[PDB]
Amino acid sequence: MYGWWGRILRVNLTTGEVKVQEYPEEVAKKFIGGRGLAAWILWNEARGVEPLSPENKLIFAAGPFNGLPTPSGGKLVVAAKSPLTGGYGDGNLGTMASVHLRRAGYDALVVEGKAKKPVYIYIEDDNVSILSAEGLWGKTTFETERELKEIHGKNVGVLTIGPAGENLVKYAVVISQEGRAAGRPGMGAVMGSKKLKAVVIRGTKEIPVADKEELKKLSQEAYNEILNSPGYPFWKRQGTMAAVEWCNTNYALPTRNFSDGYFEFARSIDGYTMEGMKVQQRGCPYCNMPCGNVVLDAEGQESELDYENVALLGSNLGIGKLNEVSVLNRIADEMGMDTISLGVSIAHVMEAVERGILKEGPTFGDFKGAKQLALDIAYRKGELGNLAAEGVKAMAEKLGTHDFAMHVKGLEVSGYNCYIYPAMALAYGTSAIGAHHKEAWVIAWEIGTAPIEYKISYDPIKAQKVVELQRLRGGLFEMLTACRLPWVEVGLSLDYYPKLLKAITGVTYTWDDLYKAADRVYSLIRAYWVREFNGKWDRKMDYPPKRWFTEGLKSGPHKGEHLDEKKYDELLSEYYRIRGWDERGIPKKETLKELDLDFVIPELEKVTNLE
Amino acid sequence: MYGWWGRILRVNLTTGEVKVQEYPEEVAKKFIGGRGLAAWILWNEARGVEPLSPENKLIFAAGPFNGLPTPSGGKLVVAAKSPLTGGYGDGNLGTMASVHLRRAGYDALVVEGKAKKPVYIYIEDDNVSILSAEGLWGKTTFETERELKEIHGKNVGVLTIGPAGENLVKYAVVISQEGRAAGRPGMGAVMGSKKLKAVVIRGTKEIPVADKEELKKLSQEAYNEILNSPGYPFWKRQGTMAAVEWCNTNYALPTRNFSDGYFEFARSIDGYTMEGMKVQQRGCPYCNMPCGNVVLDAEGQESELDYENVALLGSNLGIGKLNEVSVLNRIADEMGMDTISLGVSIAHVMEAVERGILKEGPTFGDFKGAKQLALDIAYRKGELGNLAAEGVKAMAEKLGTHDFAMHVKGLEVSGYNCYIYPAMALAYGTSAIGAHHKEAWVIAWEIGTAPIEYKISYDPIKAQKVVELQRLRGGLFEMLTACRLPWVEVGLSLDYYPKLLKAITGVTYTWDDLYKAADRVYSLIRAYWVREFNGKWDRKMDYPPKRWFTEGLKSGPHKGEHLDEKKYDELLSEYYRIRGWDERGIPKKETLKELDLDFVIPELEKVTNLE
């Protein structure tokens, strides 16, 4: 076997047992890695488990591209049954831990059980130990990684959780290298529930490559193509922050809990403003187009800015000064909580306060109040911090505020306001893990323009475009696993991927093979949700928030415009037709058989009727 | 006598003598105060003196508006014979020193002589002393003022020089409250040449007012008019920083030593970027429309930004990040040196380096090199730093780089590139103290738009507009002395001024009375220059820099356009006709008699032939 090790590191925190599981080359070829491998593991090992119980499996899954010098191939997938959504949950982050896990001889790391006290997992090739982290517990993510490196050396990959993870904030994430984050659906809370403070990894092994020279050649070509792309200069300057102006121009910038798609103060929180306050730039392993832009916040502290962070903690909160939004951003990284769900939870509180629903709490534009709430959420201080720490779905159940609860499947909607964007609304509605733009950022195509540089339509071809994008963004890139931005942003040819894959693994994958592996992952993931939800499931699970159907844009040429539910419903049926799912969004028996998921049928039938 | 004290504090640092000069009420009425009073004093007391010798007079002149609660009436004029230009030199700054000097019982303070060692002047009502400042010498302006208040208390007004003043940098200024500056033509160097490190002032006396009730009424109306003006909100947000975009849009933003009027990276150093970096907002005494916008620079330090500072230290130097420009800005303030002349001098060096004329030094866009040169100028360290510390006129004589030496009469050109703006070019050409936009910011009217919110033309009305603006901006406002921005930016009515002047002094001044006093000051100032130049004077003294006639814009729909020498010369003759001046730029015997300036006739006749 080349590329894949066929090895998965297993750590049981309850028993202290550490072992290496060998999985068949057939499974590796069939699921490829990252999310695929994770979905296979969770389907088999997390049936009916409580997300915060010792039985949940915390998975760190790499893929064949990882550990090797592949173009922006320093990504890693973190997965577990989600404490926020109750379904399959995952996330991705660039981190040296990805390079080291693979160079240490493993394709993935699976943590089960729960330690008796705070501990961290140490991995140096074949030497794996569960060590006491009593001294680290309570420290920020930044401080935890800094201290671990002060002991073991700079040459290690470190994954940590901060107080939000330790306190089981439902959208707590895993942090690496002060800025890289993974696991919006609460991977950080699953990590915290096991009393797992960090993971330190070092690898030195040579990963067996089927064609060393092709690999080295293809990689050099791709790097050069990136360096020579016309978008490279502007990408180097603004990175994802170029989307603030682009979204504002197109009425897609979430403003005041998604109330409007335009923000009057977007310029003072945009990419140009960011350029003027940038002090450093860093990136993920093996990437020659770094986009981790670091600024100084209002308190003079370094903060790494990404578009989503700014959109959800800036315009979405009615906060118009980038230096202030940057303080909130830093807090999220330090505490280890998702900037998106954090911002949407805060915005939800702000709307409830302005409406008189909540007697106390911050209002839109209130930076000091937003900062205090962010901190109270991470430390679960007071009734408000505790409520908001649960996310908008849970919070809305308690407050009767479902009308303005911006989420899909319990996962908070990200940085694109879709009052007039049917395809993007469908992307959020059908995202495998819950509302996220990860799997299909189709709004650009719907508009005809993109950040590096209108008539509302429900054409069934939009459902086809979303499935196509999900195959690449929610499948391929989450399985390799590698950054999708070189392709998305600078236009690196997708042809490099199946070639790099054969050069590495020696297996020839055609685009249809890849499209099929991605579809298998999608149906398996959906199957997981259906099974864990005990068959209680229908098409409404794939609907975007009610706000986009009952309210419209508040300003500009498109004022009053919104989504037509009837037409959205028809577009959803088209999505199901293309995926081979029934009108409830559940995979059909024939579809499962065709995707080599026969094993799913018996289990799903114990819970509902299949078609 | 009301309003005016009719008293001038006299401090001789050579003899240690402190006395109070009582001057005539008719002189007070005739010159009003500020620059008018200063020009009267310099004509009489700085005849033929070397600017850096003990005989030069350093004047801190206030007017009837000062010390009283008048709308933005906390300004102060600092004047002396200029070490940079060799003629009349002055500047203005907002400072509690203004309020305290007048409440202490004086209309002005005149310092003559030179101390044997560093000293500071201490003024508390009638108690005035020259005290040792040996421990303060060498400290920054910020630290000097901070330490003085730690001794004397926070309720004092303080004026200081930093190392640039101490080291006689030709464009050294006087600084107050970390950000307020005065005296571009080297007032700081004059102060430093006297070994005067600072002036600390405290006043408690009630200033006699003709009509206290009218004064209170008018000020209140004016304050409310400011608060309710349509421009108030945007002014509060961006202040003068709104000019970066306005100038860039109009090809008037000095870029790379005025090479072009358009900067490709203007957005990253503009007013919106500043808003996203603002952490504090300060202002001058008695102002309800504060514009001292404080940001954190690239090193996390506070830096108060003004348009000119950013245009001359940013676009003019090819530096496109506001955080970096802010480091240069803070250095200028700390060292006590003019941001404009500093930037124009650094830009001059950058062009000479690029052109190979200088073999060592910073080039455009080199922030680290610019910072090092700014520090070397302040401390006069090295041949290059010592040369640039002399100003562009002097530096150009040594390097043979007159072609790109942007100055008029030795004073560096400010933040408006006039390749296609004849009236603004004439404003710079005729400015009483040398190149400055202070006396006539006519570019706004020439274009038809303003920052608060084209066809070239040499229409003789342009000269009439420059004269009208000079009467107000270089006359009235420099004599009161009060901020001209409420009127300029927010549209406060000019009708308040004659009414407040009457309520204060009891003397009624019709607009014609004020225009005559302003022209009187302009002709007296002109007479001072001619006299001091020993009659060596002609119309070329009032010409804009050669570059605006010799080259044109480098981009935009106006690419290649420049000023025309013949049409400019005709426009200048129109300016002379309106002012009653020779074709050499010297007042006519009839004009001098007209303005009650007969005493200057004998003096000018001794040096040249009058008309």
Ligand code: SF4
């Ligand atoms: S483009 Fe950005 S997110 Fe992608 S690998 Fe590079 S630094 Fe990481």
Ligand code: SF4
């Ligand atoms: S408008 Fe600005 S410069 Fe004028 S008095 Fe007010 S704070 Fe000072």
